[PDB]
């Protein structure tokens, strides 16, 4: 009750559920994976995972093995039949703990194939392995040609020894948020080639999957067996080029709000905040919003971030500080403690995360994900 | 336990922020030398600017800091509650208050609390009345920053008057008068003198009316480093304590006898050969110019690697500086290794003090169009801190 007075990030789990339902409707031939990496994109890993699973997600996706292990360890437990996949591995990571926790683990390289095979051997339980194909993104993923040939061969031998099963073949798009970008078709072609190859050699995955949010929303031919619509599950559109949340029956899950710390009159010609990059044009009132870049308010939104205060959109006045920023209230005199709504779903006349993204020269994914740990999350409709 | 040690040893494999507390102690000594007339406050807000509030507070107190500074009352209360405790005689100040906050709990914990406004004067006086123990109040003057303090003139007249009435009722003592600079990182900016002149005037007024503060203070890091006339009784050199210079205009850390406290490093997750004409990362903003090797660094913007440093952020890998290739993702980014074939798991050093040929937080600030304060402070909770020289 006390930390929330300054500020809070309200997480509407009924919105999250509604988004999962909308995404399931949009991808009727596929299972839906709830991507809950990075503390569920800043929304809270476990509560969001629970909600998504209640709304019909049958897979959970995380980056690190620690994130996936925390899901498995949650109490009360998520259903034991939910598949949990993690993909960001480094040498010497906790492969054995993952295998014992029945996680689907991604493998993009021989080193990881060797480590997971060794861990399955030492645990006496077979691993569930997803082979990642680099189809054109040039990040994670095994390259086509000899690398893929070798990896597929090593996977087959490990299957032959009862040490694992390849449960999936997957990849990830570079440019799916730009509809008609040529790389999209090129990646889908290479994905079909590489998965056809793996299956010809003998692998029998349960799932094949490539689609992130923008592909889920715009490319039914990319749905395959499983879709991974991360940002959309949080009700945020991947890009204005793809559309608005409303275009897809989505509703932003996070509302970020604060309580004014100070409301004061100042003369004209008064500088505001570091460097004095704003100067009051005449006698006015200033409002102090007690969130700053340590809380995830991006310093790049200096002079531009929008905030609903006392019935009107205000903008940041000058530089955002570590813990606070100022707005010029133009003579209005809300009371101290009055609500300042930085972003939300938008139906109360407040800004959206996408407005902040534009103000900060970034994408809405970065805005929601990097809301700081100093801001308490308040869960509604759990 | 062995199960807890293996868990810790496990998260550090991907990445870590190494926090050298001997560097922090050295910085505190350097800053105390620089401000010989004043007590030093260790500003440990925002989880010690991303370094860890309690360990950094302890190290700063060991090195001679006699005040700790935090933004929120919750941060200040957490310092008081630390076990083993910090010395009971260290003063802890907090300044970022909102209506209905825990004034009574702060008064009972003997915190110095900042007040900029009549609402807060009323709330803290009420809390002191309910607790039956006097509050320690610092009045903040708005001397020109236009953020948190009380405006000169009638507002300050009213606030000083209210404080005097509260003192007369035994409900508080005004233990400080303070302010904060707008432009101290820009030496010779005319606002600096303007603020100091206003500060002197407002504090003189308060004392003329009867207030007797223990400390007057206005100096942040760049004022501490450059403006001895601003030291007054107490200095608050936040970023410098962490070894980071407030701006290249002020100077380098080495110019002030400072050393960066944080080193951010990761272990490569993948090293692979790719052909020429291969796009790299979202939007394909980088395309390989010929056959090359790519290295995957398993940190991304969820870990505090700013997305603005896409195509520019520097990283030491396998003996050379590399730059981010294309877009930084949520959890990873790629570098073009130009054919080099380090081992998976090899160390990628993003920033540190710079003596091992690695970049500094200032290099990332420039890459990302920001200030080094933002770089260190926003390193994500998903990156474990490893404390050395406790
Ligand atoms: C982060 C992530 C996703 C989800 O991406 P969105 O754009 O948020 O839908 C899908 N797959 C992988 C591998 C990811 O890393
Ligand atoms: C953050 C802060 C400081 C320290 O600022 P630096 O530039 O890091 O030294 C000093 N005082 C106050 C009130 C602050 O909020
Ligand atoms: Na790919
Ligand atoms: Na501001
Ligand atoms: Na300090
Ligand atoms: Na000021």
């Amino acid at each position: 009750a006390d930390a929330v007075l300054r500020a809070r990030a309200e997480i509407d789990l009924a919105a999250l559920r509604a988004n999962v339902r909308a995404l399931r409707e949009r991808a009727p031939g596929a299972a839906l994976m709830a991507v809950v990496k990075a503390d569920a994109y800043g929304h809270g890993a476990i509560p969001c995972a629970r909600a998504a699973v209640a709304a019909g997600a049958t897979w959970l996706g995380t980056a690190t093995p620690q994130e996936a292990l925390a899901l498995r360890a949650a109490e009360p437990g998520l259903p034991d039949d939910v598949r949990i996949m993690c993909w960001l591995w480094t040498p010497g990571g906790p492969w054995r703990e993952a295998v014992e926790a029945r996680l689907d683990v991604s493998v993009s390289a021989m080193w990881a194939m060797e480590e997971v095979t060794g861990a399955a051997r030492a645990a006496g339980v077979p691993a569930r392995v997803q082979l990642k194909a680099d189809t054109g993104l040039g990040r994670g993923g095994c390259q086509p040609g000899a690398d893929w040939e070798r990896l597929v061969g090593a996977a087959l031998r490990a299957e032959e020894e009862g040490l694992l099963r390849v449960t999936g073949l997957w990849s990830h798009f570079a440019c799916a948020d730009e509809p008609g970008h040529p790389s999209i078709a090129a990646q889908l072609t290479r994905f079909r080639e590489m998965t056809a190859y793996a299956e010809q050699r003998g692998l029998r995955p349960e799932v094949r999957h490539i689609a992130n949010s923008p592909a889920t929303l715009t490319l039914p031919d990319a749905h395959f067996d499983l879709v991974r619509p991360g940002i959309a599950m949080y009700g945020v559109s991947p890009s204005p080029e793809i559309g608005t949340p409303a275009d897809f029956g989505l509703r932003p899950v996070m509302t970020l709000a604060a309580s004014l710390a100070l409301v004061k009159q100042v003369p004209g010609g008064h500088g505001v905040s570091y460097g004095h990059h704003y100067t009051t044009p005449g006698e006015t009132t200033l409002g102090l919003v007690p969130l700053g870049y340590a809380d995830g308010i991006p310093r790049h939104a200096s002079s531009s971030g929008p905030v609903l205060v006392d019935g009107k959109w205000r903008t940041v006045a000058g530089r955002i500080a570590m813990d606070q920023f100022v707005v010029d209230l133009g003579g209005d005199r809300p009371e101290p403690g009055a609500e300042a709504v930085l972003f939300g779903p938008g139906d109360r006349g407040e800004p959206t995360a996408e407005d902040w993204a534009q103000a900060a020269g970034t994408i809405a994914y970065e805005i929601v994900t990097r809301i700081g740990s100093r801001v308490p999350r308040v869960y509604v409709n759990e």
Side-chain angles (χ1 to χ4, degrees), chain A residues 238-293:
Chain A
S239 63
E241 208 82 333
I242 294 279
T244 64
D247 291 339
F248 307 99
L250 305 174
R251 181 176 179 79
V253 176
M254 186 186 289
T255 303
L256 176 63
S259 297
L260 293 178
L262 192 66
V263 180
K264 71 188 176 189
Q265 188 176 62
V266 304
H270 202 291
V272 179
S273 197
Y274 298 127
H276 284 346
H277 289 99
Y278 183 77
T279 298
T280 54
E283 176 176 82
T284 192
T285 45
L286 299 180
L288 189 63
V289 178
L291 286 167
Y293 61 71

Side-chain angles (χ1 to χ4, degrees), chain A residues 277-339:
Chain A
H277 289 99
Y278 183 77
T279 298
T280 54
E283 176 176 82
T284 192
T285 45
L286 299 180
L288 189 63
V289 178
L291 286 167
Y293 61 71
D295 305 291
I297 304 316
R299 189 171 174 278
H300 286 249
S302 291
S303 303
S304 64
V307 198
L308 177 64
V309 190
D310 193 33
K312 309 186 32 176
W313 278 36
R314 320 297 177 150
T315 66
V316 183
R319 286 281 177 70
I320 290 164
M322 186 171 297
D323 315 296
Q324 62 183 207
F325 62 89
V326 181
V327 301
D328 188 335
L329 294 168
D332 299 333
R333 287 171 175 275
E335 293 290 303
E339 191 166 65

Side-chain angles (χ1 to χ4, degrees), chain A residues 323-371:
Chain A
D323 315 296
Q324 62 183 207
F325 62 89
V326 181
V327 301
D328 188 335
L329 294 168
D332 299 333
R333 287 171 175 275
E335 293 290 303
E339 191 166 65
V341 182
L342 284 75
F343 65 79
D347 72 290
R348 286 168 218 296
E350 78 281 21
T352 67
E354 176 62 31
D355 297 316
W356 279 85
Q358 292 182 21
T362 190
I363 59 176
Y365 292 74
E366 195 183 30
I367 297 299
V368 297
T369 301
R370 300 181 68 195
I371 302 305

